Write a protein that binds this ligand. Structure first.
Ligand SMILES: COc1ccc(CC[C@@H](OC(=O)[C@@H]2CCCCN2C(=O)[C@H](C)c2ccc(Cl)s2)c2cccc(OCC(=O)O)c2)cc1OC
Length: 128
């Protein structure tokens, strides 16, 4: 499955190298440029618990997910992950709880100490 493929082949993109966030590029993007801290980014995503439950998709709303990178508007794993991405890229991330919702979780949807999986498509990004 896609999550197990990330376990096996994913690059560790954490600074501590604790395998907290693992990444595979599934479709290559355009150019060399990746977003800077403070850039406005536009993505589509599909997310689930590592074991398959709680599937959630922005495509639901025909509606890009928009946020400012590196401002702590999203879980740590997304600030780390999206910053590695090029415009047009689709990546898979597997995320240990320390980089997500931790021991608190977000009940009942996300349990204590949950590993998450996302497929993220970076549509565009623009400066502050
Ligand atoms: C800095 O740390 C945080 C910052 C924000 C949050 C809140 C959750 C955040 O969610 C997330 O950071 C991740 C990654 C972005 C897409 C949604 N996220 C999810 O986990 C979703 C809920 C999942 C989908 C399937 C899963 Cl299983 S988990 C989120 C959800 C919905 C909207 C939003 O911004 C704009 C608004 O308020 O309208 C932001 C949680 C944080 O830490 C635990």
């Amino acid at each position: 499955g896609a999550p197990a493929t990330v376990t096996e082949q994913g690059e560790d993109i954490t600074s501590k190298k604790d395998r907290g966030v693992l990444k595979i590029v599934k479709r290559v993007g355009n150019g060399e440029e990746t977003p800077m801290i403070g850039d406005k980014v536009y993505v589509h995503y599909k997310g689930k618990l590592s074991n398959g439950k709680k599937f959630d998709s922005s495509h639901d709303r025909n509606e890009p997910f928009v946020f400012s990178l590196g401002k702590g508007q999203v879980i740590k794993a997304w600030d780390i992950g999206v910053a590695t991405m090029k415009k047009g890229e689709i990546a898979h991330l597997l995320i240990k709880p320390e980089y997500a919702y931790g021991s608190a979780g977000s009940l009942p949807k996300i349990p204590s100490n949950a590993t998450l999986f996302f497929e993220i498509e970076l549509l565009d990004f623009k400066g502050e």
